[PDB]
Symmetry: C4
Amino acid sequence: GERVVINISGLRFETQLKTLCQFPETLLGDPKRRMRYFDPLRNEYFFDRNRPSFDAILYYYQSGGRIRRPVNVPIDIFSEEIRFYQLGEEAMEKFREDEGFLREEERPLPRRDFQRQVWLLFEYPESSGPARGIAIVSVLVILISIVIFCLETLPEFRDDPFFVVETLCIIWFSFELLVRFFACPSKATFSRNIMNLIDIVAIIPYFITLGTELSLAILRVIRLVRVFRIFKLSRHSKGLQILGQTLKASMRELGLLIFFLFIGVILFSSAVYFAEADDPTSGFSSIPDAFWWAVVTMTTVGYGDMHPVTIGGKIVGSLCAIAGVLTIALPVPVIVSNFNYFYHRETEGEEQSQYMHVG
Amino acid sequence: GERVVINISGLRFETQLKTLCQFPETLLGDPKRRMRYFDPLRNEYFFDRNRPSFDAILYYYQSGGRIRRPVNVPIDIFSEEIRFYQLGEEAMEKFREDEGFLREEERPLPRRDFQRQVWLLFEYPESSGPARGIAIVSVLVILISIVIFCLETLPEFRDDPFFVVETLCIIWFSFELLVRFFACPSKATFSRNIMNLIDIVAIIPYFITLGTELSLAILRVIRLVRVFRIFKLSRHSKGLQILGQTLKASMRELGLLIFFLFIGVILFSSAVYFAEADDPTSGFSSIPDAFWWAVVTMTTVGYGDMHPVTIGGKIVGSLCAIAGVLTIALPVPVIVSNFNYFYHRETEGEEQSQYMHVG
Amino acid sequence: GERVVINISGLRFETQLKTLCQFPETLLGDPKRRMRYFDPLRNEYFFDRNRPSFDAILYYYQSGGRIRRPVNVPIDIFSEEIRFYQLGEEAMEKFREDEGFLREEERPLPRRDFQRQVWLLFEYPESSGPARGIAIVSVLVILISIVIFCLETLPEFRDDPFFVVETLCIIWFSFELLVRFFACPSKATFSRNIMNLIDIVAIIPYFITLGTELSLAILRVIRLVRVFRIFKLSRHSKGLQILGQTLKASMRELGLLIFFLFIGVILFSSAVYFAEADDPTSGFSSIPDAFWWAVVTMTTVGYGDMHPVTIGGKIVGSLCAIAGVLTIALPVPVIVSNFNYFYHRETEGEEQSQYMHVG
Amino acid sequence: GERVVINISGLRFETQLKTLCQFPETLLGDPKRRMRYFDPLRNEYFFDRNRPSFDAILYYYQSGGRIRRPVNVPIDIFSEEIRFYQLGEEAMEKFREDEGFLREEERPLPRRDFQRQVWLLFEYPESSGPARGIAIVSVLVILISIVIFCLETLPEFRDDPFFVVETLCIIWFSFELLVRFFACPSKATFSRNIMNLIDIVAIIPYFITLGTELSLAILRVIRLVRVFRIFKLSRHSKGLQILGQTLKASMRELGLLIFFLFIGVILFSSAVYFAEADDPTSGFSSIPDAFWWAVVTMTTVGYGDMHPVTIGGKIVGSLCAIAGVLTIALPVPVIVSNFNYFYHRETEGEEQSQYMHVG
């Protein structure tokens, strides 16, 4: 009912007493903690603290829980004022998701001594010595395997000695498969994180080769999954994580690029067909034939096998070359801004934020 | 004449009384509403409200109606303060066009039960069940029709069976034509929204084929309007609306791109002509011939049929390749900023704004 | 010596009296103008004006003349407060060059009635009726002339009838030359504005043809100045003015682009020479020969006449293709930001600024 | 224990006295300097200074040394207030590294009269007359030498007269080598600055030619270091310094570009191999052969020697052309922002900052 006066180093704030009695745990809401800040000659509380920061602390009492931050006060100064006014760890955690820095995820443990030794030994290569030694050999097994796959597709050998070279890798592809299937917090959550479901498609398509030798169009595609062994490098590369979430945060913005271009692939190929169908020398036999000419011009690749020849086709091709810029440059800066939003918060993100946030 | 003191939680404001008597309907302007906020021991009115928000509410009384917003206070907080001070729905609507979020347009009704059932059934596919079922079939009729037009221009059949395939579509192009011509709020405003005038050019150029078979250069162009059937997909695509307004907001900024390039198409073709006219092997027969070489180089497409050969032409072509970047990259970022201005206010625009604006 | 208190609607400011006595013409500095704002019950001056705007007006008295503007207060509100406090037209003009909007240039007059009629008739086409009629015919004379120059270089006529076509233009190129040489504020300043010195190079190189027919390498270049007739279109085009100042504000930033690329033209051509000199089939005869290959790859034009063939040249050409992006994309966004700085202040610039600035 | 009141032109600040007694050298902390600002009728100190600037000066006393700056107050105004309040040269230097402008590096001297004359004569060409005359001749020695190296690789002379032309340069490459080796502050720090270690690789690879004439694959590469003579131009070019630090500040961001592309060079070449291996006419013999096709398409260079022919390869090449944009445009704007961060602070950087910072 009655009101209180709070004097933050010369700046006067006046709220009713019952507003501070919403949160009877904090500094301002507990009548025995603030009694050493009272000033009986002026009937007010004097804090020699930051001036522009208390305007946000007062709003947390009035709004009932919303923690904002003014532009002037930095992160390392506003975080101390939450610690000084004792707003609580629920109030402190609201400064996380307001700012954008997400909390750390607690990892489950296999509640033993054997499986708790080997879980932190391979999943967390920064733990121990051979944990750093298991990472420096896990980069080789994929890197040799992508090279011999590049070496198997060489025309010197295609036009079994390499079988002892590849089985040197797949048993190591089983060696990290076997020791990780059963050492996990739960087999359920081991089948959720996509970084290992993709790895078992490096052991199945080699295994289907053995059952088939001991349907020819299938035999090409089951060696095509041997190009997916380059996706295992995302385990030991921080950059592909940032590229990984960039597409993962732009499922829709990529589909708007493909749809925006595909109208022009229909439109300009049909426009150059109806201006170059009157020529026995013109290569444009069909609109299905002229689909390749469109996507090369709008991407400004410009091969030079296909050529418009009449004057009506060259003005069609001129407007196709201009509109390829505008049908590409519009959706893509939201993909650069999505990438930098993830690039910032991984290499320089939690080095200033969480250093003075959690405490 | 006399002045009043308003105390917004410790911050004192003092205006004359006649300034509050400009708007004798609101909270501060009505002498029986504010009488429960008076403080007879200090001769002032005490509000325990947001501090930096009242600086904008006070300016609305002084300026006579202008509603601004400080940078600090968000949209969801400044909107409550207009609701608390009871500034009025005309004052609340000024927070719309100041912020930029435009009001919703009221749609007219055909004041019946038959035509009011069928107006909301096809124009508003989110209304009912078969309203969502009429949209999933309206995407097929255009999509098959663009495919058979691509299939009619195949060279396997050109070098009537397809007539029963296309008339399967045009009667459906009449089926959405017929039921929408007469079910409308007014036939006048049905002929204003361009999304249906373009649709009737998918029934007229097929109809001119029938009168002509039952002038050869006209027969090509009346099949050229069968490429305009891809423009009907903007009815069931939110993305082409955003691309649609992007060109619609940059009629002038596109014409500055075409004019800026076209000076270089004249200039560099004339410069490479006067350095390569001294060669019987040079392909550059004319400045009308060298127009095609210019627009390919400045767009960095680079076909490779045309080749400058002398040393004087290669330095001309070098400056043509550099200046193609600067004659393209300058006008286009105002077209990316116009696109993102419409991209933001359609998918994430009214999800934070109007959720706490209208009330 | 003594101090004054100024109360801007509840906010108290206190300066010494001698600070207001620096500028004894304004409202606060003149002791008979502010005497109707005095408040003898509080010993202060009460203004019911804008609160955050007076913090900048007070700094103008303390600093001795510097007029700033806070971020919060707009242009149309801060301009009224200078008008209300009567700071003066010298103080008002300091709000121009602080904000960036330059003053209008006063044009000189030929102090007569004949020459003052004809000066505003052609230089200012927005003056009268035929002033708009002289602009619609001044666009034709250059546009026909650029076409017949394009038509003279046609190979149908080169491989005198066109002389009566071109002299139809050059006498009109004399008709705007003659009536503007002598109608001017001064013949001195008529020879300074570059928009007419360039026009007289459309009458001299045609005139040298007549003295020579009534040295063959000169005869080509004196028809090469007939491509400079496209530069006269900047008189009746607002866009080329903005492009004109963009290069005119980036003399240095263009030279940093040409120098940055030219290191790569030396470097990669020498690197591909030393990896492809071991081949009788390689086209790269010299580093002067491989200069053309470098500038085509780094600009991503990619003709396709020149081809690296050995494996050592393809890895050289791969790094040449990547580094062409970084040797182009770095200097150019300061040229887009210079263009938009001039694009904004010509079509939408003085429509909000000077509408409430000068008064 | 007791508190003081400071009145910055109407704005009241109140801190305890012991907070000002942390820094007993400044104006507020020294009880004989502030005694002429006291006001015995109000028991406070009155300063007629800038209002929003003292909120940052007060925080320097409370935080114990941190000097911030509000957004409102400029650099030339906040710097005067540090000078007026006498915060000290250690406090003044904290305004440097907070703002970002680094201090000037003191150069060592050879403590003589001979070597101190010649150190400032060549390293500092802005010192004297012939110091500007030694720079205008130091640009020629490298520029002729890069030309005769371009002239030695001409095919008119390769398919000794030029030896007296090149030794005219290398003795001048010794003339700036000899006079700078021994005139330095220390021979240790002369071997640290990379701008001269690179210069001595313009005298060693010519010297190995003399020992070998008075191993053929070495003879090519020791003339390949004669392309490194273009790197000496960074001594007399301010622009290459800014490009020099741009790569020097993006060692990691360049490696993320090469790694991001190289996944696509593996992926799409393997995808176009498995769709074009079924053709005797297809040029794609191997994935090592198709590596060149990938990096040309993703960079949108598009030579035109290699051509996908089947329909399955053209849809593979279409997605390769699109994804080349997204595998290039993502890392590069952090390299444009790193370049402009160095471009700003060298030509317009210390012209506003240090003009009113150091004093």
